[PDB]
């Protein structure tokens, strides 16, 4: 079974999620004929740098001509899809970074392309190249032969010398949005005929940050754990994240200074056998979200809709100073947790400390 | 088609090169009066005209009419040098060939008289990458050069060269092209190319060039690609915003003026582009420290931070020192407590909120 | 020859592994459904069986019968892997092979077909110790390797790995074994080994294991060696230096009443008796936590402390919760920095002094 990431690599400019600006620029350049000879791509991991680079290379060498909408069926397109085209020289700079390799590469750039109209060099992981390798490419980048094009992809463009950055057109790819990742996952699962639920897709998109490859890997892991299906419970178990309802209830109990309710809920959580560090992190995240809501109404997204209204109630009643005090207390408790005699004891003592210094209802003093 | 805008508009006459008046005047006077040194060394930043000026000098040093500062451009020698296939003009890319053997052969080649030129000029580019033995051989050859041999050297890091080689050649240092000259050159190029443009777009491109005409031309070409055959204010502004990577100073400026929505927008924009949060925090700390030191003394701000000199100077002038100190302290506390935050982004947002609309209570020695 | 219990009782089948139910279920589902990935990363604390899980997975992949989640353990491939001489299983100690040359040599042999097995498995132990260049070199091949090679990664510090590697691997987090599971495994091993034992000794060893099975086995072996071949409760208590008596209660009472002479005399007597200071600090922290919890609710006191219940109750009636929190925090800080003190006794005395401020010859063959 070929993995989802390799199977679903885009094969056309209509199959790429987001990245509207770079796609529009490339399409306009190919249509108008104003084609440069050095392209650099930058962005975070798993956002489609190599994919768009290969798509551009296929578009340049298509038999029908130079178009922004390659056919995808001619011999050149098929060979490039299969990764065996002769005129697409793909180089792994991370594996070959010595200067002599660059000298050997540049010694035979004058020869005409074997079959295609252009001989496209696609270098990956450029930042791993040595300084001498960087210097050796300056003249070739400035004045390459008419039948040579350079495509460069890297994750940290700040590592390159300024001289190289001034020789090539730079395109920066942005992290994909949560909605885009969710839509792509839904489409892929529908094409693969796999059962899924909206909550599972939402959780996977949230946990994927902005890299779609991470989302695909998490989806594959969830499918493996779920035994051929994607279920909300399976995703929750995989991520090991408790539902927001329990943490929200615990925070509400803490705010109102109800020691018995807090202790009972902690005992129930212990019976459930959840992780204590995850519980503390969730409580801190809830407090941070409440503080940001206090800062501005729009700071809360739809991901919290299921509890949004209730959370909003805490925004208009707790003074900001109390929120800051609770946040700092929980942060300090999490800081000192590793040295505590037990995780359960540490969390219980942190909650007791929070209750003792409660601004409004402190525990009674002795007499 | 259309070649490349930078590669197409390389100057071919002393009247076309813009700026660098002192170097051009000195070279013209030296050629007119017959005072020609045995070795020249051009230095400066990237994309200022070192190679162009070297090629112009070589063309004017072997013209059929005679040694002049205004070469005809029509005789055989001028045409061949323009085509880059002149017999006597031996141009060597030192970066690609740094070993002792290549330099040894090239320097041994000097023993032969020129074929069809009064001088045999060697144009060594990127001289700082030569090996130590290569430098020794070059020094041995250059101590007593023949009367018919001249050396032209172009480099960007002259400090790498040994003192002995530096003492044997006359050094010309080029300066930044400034905003106005770059803007005028872009206007002229676009007028010649029959491309629509707006003054504000050209001003923005010149400002973003940062004293490098090659960068300005590359950005102009990219904007033309994005603008669909024309340059417009909106397209250029969007392109720069996509390429903008100075979120730290913008965040500091927004925070200092007590704005919340702007800070959230800047945080979202920074999150869109792959960025390390701790790097952003330390950058903000450094900016605040620099502003404080500038407030202490106007000479603190060096020439390195020339791009953002005006905004930082204005912030130092307007913001009272106490606010700067408080912001520095709170951001230092935020950096200290960052690793224990529930999430890097949430921790950064919390620290920004604290610096924006909060004030810590100092221990205040009570005893 | 004789082998320690830690290595002799290494699990050989999926039925001999305690806990880690989610990981085993995911692996079994993936093997059954045929969805085989080419990058598995086992992360977690130490002494939980990452290497054992990786070896079992590799054995299952290269079994003669076929790709099964239950390796036979008797065919030639299984026994060859058990003996560690299997040709197609390349076990790489990343802690001693960090140089780029070794990784480059490794990646140049990935294009050859397996010798006898159906897959070529690379098991990299402690991959977090490789250099940056090693990670970058791996990236390209790990992204899309051939169809006859599988990569298995085991580490205990996933933070070290760059995000690029993590984005292209299936991550499996191993939980820490509970006290009950460790006790069950220990009693099973001892019964199989024909070693006398008592429930209290096993409970103490499980508690001291701190969630690591390797640590539990090492402690059991130490007790057996020093216990004259018998795991006795008295021997384990002596080895572990358990307080047993109510010394911690007396010390905490003396500290609370702020009687320097009493606490100093108690510490001197304890040092004369030669007890473990870490155990004393842990016991004091537990007593403080119990006192605070009882102060929360009178019924929170456990039934095992009846013999010292009454005294504790008095503390809960005479000490405000804030003072209890302060004492707990001070003791925790003292525990944290105990190793860094010049002497353990000096550290304990310093912590207690800090707390007191709170108040209203037969020579064989050696020269």
């Amino acid at each position: 079974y070929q993995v989802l990431a390799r199977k679903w690599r885009p094969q056309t400019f209509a199959d790429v999620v987001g990245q509207e600006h770079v796609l529009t620029a490339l399409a306009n350049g190919l249509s108008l004929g104003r084609i440069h000879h050095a392209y650099l791509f930058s962005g975070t991991r798993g956002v489609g740098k190599t994919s768009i680079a290969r798509l551009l290379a296929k578009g340049l060498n298509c038999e029908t001509g130079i178009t922004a909408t390659p056919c995808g069926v001619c011999d050149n397109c098929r060979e490039i899809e299969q990764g065996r085209f002769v005129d697409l020289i793909e180089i792994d700079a991370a594996s070959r970074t010595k200067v002599e390799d660059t000298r050997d590469l540049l010694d035979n750039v004058q020869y005409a392309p074997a079959r295609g109209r252009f001989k496209v060099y696609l270098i990956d992981e450029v930042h791993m190249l040595s300084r001498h390798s960087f210097n050796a490419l300056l003249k070739t980048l400035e004045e390459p032969p008419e039948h040579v094009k350079f495509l460069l992809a890297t994750t940290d463009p700040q590592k390159l010398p300024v001289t190289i950055l001034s020789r090539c057109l730079q395109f920066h790819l942005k992290a994909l949005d949560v909605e885009q990742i969710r839509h792509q996952l839904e489409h892929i699962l529908n094409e693969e005929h796999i059962a899924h639920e909206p909550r599972a897709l939402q959780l996977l998109a949230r946990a994927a940050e902005g890299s779609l490859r991470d989302a695909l890997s998490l989806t594959d892991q969830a499918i493996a754990s779920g035994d051929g299906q994607v279920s909300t419970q399976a995703v929750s178990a995989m991520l090991g994240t408790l539902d927001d309802d329990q943490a929200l209830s615990l925070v509400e109990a803490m705010v109102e200074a109800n020691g018995e309710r807090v202790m009972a809920l902690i005992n129930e959580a212990a019976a459930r056998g959840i992780e204590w560090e995850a519980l503390l992190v969730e409580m801190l995240g809830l407090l941070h979200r409440i503080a940001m809501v206090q800062l501005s109404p729009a700071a809360l997204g739809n991901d919290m809709a299921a509890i949004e209204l209730r959370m909003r109630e805490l925004a208009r009643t707790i003074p900001p100073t109390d929120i800051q005090l609770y946040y700092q207390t929980l942060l300090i408790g999490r800081k000192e947790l590793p040295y505590a005699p037990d995780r359960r004891m540490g969390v219980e003592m942190t909650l007791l400390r929070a209750l003792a210094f409660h601004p409004r209802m402190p525990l009674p003093e002795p007499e | 088609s259309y070649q490349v805008l930078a590669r197409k508009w390389r100057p071919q006459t002393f009247a076309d090169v813009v700026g660098q008046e002192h170097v051009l005047t000195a070279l013209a006077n030296g050629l007119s009066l017959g005072r020609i040194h045995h070795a020249y060394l051009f230095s400066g930043t990237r994309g200022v005209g070192k190679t162009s000026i070297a090629r112009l000098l070589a063309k004017g040093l072997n013209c059929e009419t005679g040694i002049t500062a205004t070469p005809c451009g029509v005789c055989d020698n001028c045409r061949e040098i323009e085509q880059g296939r002149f017999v006597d003009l031996i141009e060597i890319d030192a970066a690609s060939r740094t070993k002792v053997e290549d330099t040894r052969d090239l320097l041994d080649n000097v023993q032969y008289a020129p074929a069809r030129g009064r001088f045999k000029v060697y144009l060594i580019d990127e001289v700082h990458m030569l090996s130590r033995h290569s430098f020794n051989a070059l020094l041995k050859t250059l101590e007593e050069p023949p009367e018919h041999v001249k050396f032209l050297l172009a480099t960007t890091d002259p400090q790498k060269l040994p003192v002995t080689i530096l003492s044997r050649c006359l050094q010309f240092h080029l300066k930044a092209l400034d905003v106005e000259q770059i803007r005028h050159q872009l206007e002229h190029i676009l007028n010649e190319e029959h491309i629509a443009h707006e003054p504000r777009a050209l001003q923005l491109l010149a400002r973003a060039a940062e004293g490098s005409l090659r960068d300005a031309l590359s950005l102009t070409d990219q904007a033309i690609a994005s603008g669909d055959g024309q340059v417009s204010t909106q397209a250029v502004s969007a392109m720069l915003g996509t390429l903008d990577d100075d979120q730290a100073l913008s965040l500091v400026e927004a925070m200092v003026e007590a704005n919340g929505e702007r800070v959230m927008a800047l945080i979202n924009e920074a999150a869109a582009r792959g960025i390390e949060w701790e790097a952003l925090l330390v950058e903000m700390l450094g900016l605040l420290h620099r502003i404080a030191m500038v407030q202490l003394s106007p000479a603190a701000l060096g020439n390195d931070m020339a791009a953002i000199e005006l905004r930082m100077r204005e912030l130092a002038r307007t913001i009272p020192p106490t606010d700067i100190q408080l912001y520095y302290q709170t951001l230092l506390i935020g950096r200290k407590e960052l690793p224990y935050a529930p999430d890097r982004r949430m921790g950064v947002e919390m620290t920004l909120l604290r610096a924006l609309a909060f004030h810590p209570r100092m221990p205040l020695p009570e005893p | 020859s004789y082998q320690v219990l830690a290595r002799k009782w290494r699990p050989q089948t999926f039925a001999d592994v305690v806990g880690q139910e989610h990981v085993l279920t995911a692996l079994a589902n993936g093997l059954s459904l045929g969805r085989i990935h080419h990058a598995y990363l086992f992360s977690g604390t130490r002494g939980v069986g990452k290497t054992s899980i990786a070896r079992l997975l590799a054995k299952g992949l290269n079994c003669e019968t076929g790709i099964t989640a239950t390796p036979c353990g008797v065919c030639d491939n299984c026994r060859e892997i058990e003996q560690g001489r299997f040709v197609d299983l390349i076990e790489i100690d990343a802690a001693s092979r960090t140089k780029v040359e070794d990784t480059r040599d490794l990646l140049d042999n990935v294009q050859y077909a397996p010798a006898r097995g159906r897959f070529k498995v690379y098991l990299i132990d402690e991959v977090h110790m490789l250099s940056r260049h090693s990670f970058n070199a791996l990236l390209k091949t790990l992204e899309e390797p051939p169809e006859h090679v599988k990569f298995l990664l085991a580490t205990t510090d996933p933070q070290k790995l760059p995000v690029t590697i993590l984005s292209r691997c299936l991550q499996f987090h191993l939980k820490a074994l509970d006290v009950e599971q460790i006790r069950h495994q220990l009693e099973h091993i001892l019964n199989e080994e024909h070693i006398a034992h008592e429930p209290r000794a096993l409970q103490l060893l499980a508690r001291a294991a701190e969630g690591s099975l390797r640590d539990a086995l090492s402690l059991t072996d130490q007790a057996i060696a020093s216990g004259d071949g018998q795991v006795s409760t008295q021997a384990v208590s002596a080895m572990l230096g358990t307080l047993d008596d109510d010394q911690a209660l007396s010390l905490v009472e003396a500290m609370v009443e702020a009687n320097g002479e009493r606490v100093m005399a108690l510490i001197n007597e304890a040092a004369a008796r030669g007890i473990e200071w870490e155990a004393l600090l842990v016991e004091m922290l537990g007593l403080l936590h119990r006192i605070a919890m009882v102060q929360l609710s009178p019924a929170a006191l456990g039934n095992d402390m009846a013999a010292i219940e009454l005294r504790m109750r008095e503390l809960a009636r005479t000490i405000p919760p804030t003072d209890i929190q302060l004492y707990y925090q001070t003791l925790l800080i003292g525990r944290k920095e105990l190793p860094y003190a010049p002497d353990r006794r000096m550290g304990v005395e310093m912590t207690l002094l800090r707390a007191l401020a709170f108040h209203p010859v037969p020579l064989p063959e050696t020269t």
Binding site: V293, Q294, L295, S296, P297, A315, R316, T317, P319, P320, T321, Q324, L325, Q328, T329, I332, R353, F357 | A258, G260, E261, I333, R354, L356, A357, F358, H359, P360, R361, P363, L364, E366 | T322, Q325, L326, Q329
Partner: peptide, 29 residues
């Protein structure tokens, strides 16, 4: 000053006081 403030200072918890209430944009009591 106050015993509670001294205890919070000793515990390492930093107490934050609002300086610019106008900065916050929302219903806050």
């Amino acid at each position: 000053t106050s015993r509670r403030d001294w205890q919070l200072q000793q515990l390492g918890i930093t107490q934050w006081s609002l300086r610019r209430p106008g900065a916050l944009q929302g219903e806050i009591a």
